[PDB]
């Protein structure tokens, strides 16, 4: 509440608390962290990105988004923890410090702020945006089916009332197009990580196609390493693979898009658990989730700085 050291990372928070936290961190570490507004949500909420940088030009960067599906509360929670951890670990952990000395990290903690507020206000299990309009009484888009990556192919629904509605057209959702513009403008993203829950998967492209990416040996080996790393803290077991082979055909996804933009290190995380609590993960599992998931992200970041 009054500092990042006082903020309770072991509980779920509302939108206003997470936004206030962003200000606390920026005030506490003005030299390392910048808050960027890359857009406004459908219902006009600021869309915020935290930039961690040690200086430089337009340094190669890591993108990280969390909470694009609003009900996956473990992701926004992890996302606050990560932001603190970046400030803690800089100059303490030789490895994280070599990363920030050369690369920037862009972290979007609440990708889908309207959906998030709605999970607090009215429906805990809401996952879509809150865009209206058309020939429908149904609200919102699945923002992870809205990307220009096999948009409107099988693996996404053309029904507005669907939980997997893709939207009217690729990048209809302002929460998506804001990211698109942001990353295309920057032009120097090397990794792109989207954070989801649940089922304990690490996934690389594609969802939308059975085509093998050209980088599949490397991405596979990276995913293997990062899952090994993650499991080392608490024994938490992930599976890894391409989206389409591991789950099922899915179109308009984040990672397919970023990989098609030439961002090679494009991974999605589905965090704990495997279905005991599902989206309603106990607050007592926040910090352990955040701590292990860090070891997996770190591993990918290392690989990135290195290739």
Q: Catalytic site residues?
A: 270
C-alpha span between 79 and 257 (Å, rounded): 22
Give least dist CB 268 to Zn ion, A.
8
Give least dist CB 220 to Zn ion, A.
22
Q: Specify the residue, 131 or 197, whose C-beta has the smaller distance to Zn ion.
A: 197
Residue 248 is assigned to a ligand binding site: yes
Query: Which are the contacts of 262, defined by CB distance < 8 A and separation ≥ 6?
Result: none
Q: Specify the residue, 32 or 230, whose C-beta has the smaller distance to Zn ion.
A: 230
Q: Specify the residue, 75 or 242, whose C-beta has the smaller distance to Zn ion.
A: 75
Residue 166 is assigned to a ligand binding site: no
CB 213 within 8 A of CB 205: yes
Residue pointed to by tokens 């072991």: 10
Which residues of this protein are in contact with Zn ion, per CB under 5 A?
69, 72, 196
Residue 90 is assigned to a ligand binding site: no
Going across the sheet that includes 189-197, the strands are: 33-40, 46-52, 104-108, 61-66, 189-197, 265-271, 201-204, 239-242
Query: Which are the contacts of 7, defined by CB distance < 8 A and separation ≥ 6?
Result: 1, 21, 24, 80, 84
Token pair recorded at residue 201: 């998967």
Q: Specify the residue, 72 or 104, whose C-beta has the smaller distance to Zn ion.
A: 72
Give least dist CB 148 to Zn ion, A.
19
Residue 127 is assigned to a ligand binding site: yes
Residue pointed to by tokens 């898009």: 257
Give least dist CB 253 to Zn ion, A.
10
Binding residue positions for Zn(2+): 69, 72, 196
Binding residue positions: 69-72, 127, 144-145, 196-198, 248
């Amino acid at each position: 509440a009054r500092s990042t050291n006082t903020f309770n990372y072991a509980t779920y928070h509302t939108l206003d608390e997470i936004y206030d936290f962003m200000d606390l961190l920026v005030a506490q570490h003005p030299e390392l962290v910048s808050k960027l507004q890359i857009g406004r949500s459908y219902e006009g909420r600021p869309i915020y990105v935290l930039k961690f940088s040690t200086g430089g030009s337009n340094r190669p960067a890591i993108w990280i988004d969390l909470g694009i599906h609003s009900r996956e509360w473990i992701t926004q929670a992890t996302g606050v923890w990560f932001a603190k951890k970046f400030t803690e670990n800089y100059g303490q952990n030789p490895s994280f410090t070599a990363i920030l000395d050369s690369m920037d990290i862009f972290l979007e903690i609440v990708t889908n702020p309207n959906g998030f507020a709605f999970t607090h206000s009215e429906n805990r299990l809401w996952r879509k945006t809150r865009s209206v309009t058309s020939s429908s009484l149904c609200v919102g888009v699945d923002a992870n089916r809205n990307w220009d990556a096999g948009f409107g192919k099988a693996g996404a629904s053309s029904s507005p009332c669907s939980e997997t509605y893709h939207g009217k057209y690729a990048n209809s959702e302002v929460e998506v197009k804001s990211i698109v513009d942001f990353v295309k403008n920057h032009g120097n993203f090397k990794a792109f990580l989207s954070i989801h829950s649940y089922s304990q998967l690490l996934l690389y492209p594609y969802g939308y196609t059975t085509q093998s990416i050209p980088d599949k040996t490397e991405l596979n080996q990276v995913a293997k390493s990062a899952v090994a790393a993650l499991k080392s803290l608490y024994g938490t077991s992930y599976k890894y693979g391409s989206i389409i082979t591991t789950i099922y055909q899915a179109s308009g996804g984040s990672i397919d898009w970023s990989y098609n933009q030439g961002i090679k290190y494009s991974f999605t995380f589905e965090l704990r658990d495997t279905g005991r609590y599902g989206f309603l993960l106990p607050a007592s599992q926040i910090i352990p989730t955040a701590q292990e998931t860090w070891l997996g992200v770190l591993t990918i970041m290392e690989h990135t700085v290195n290739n």
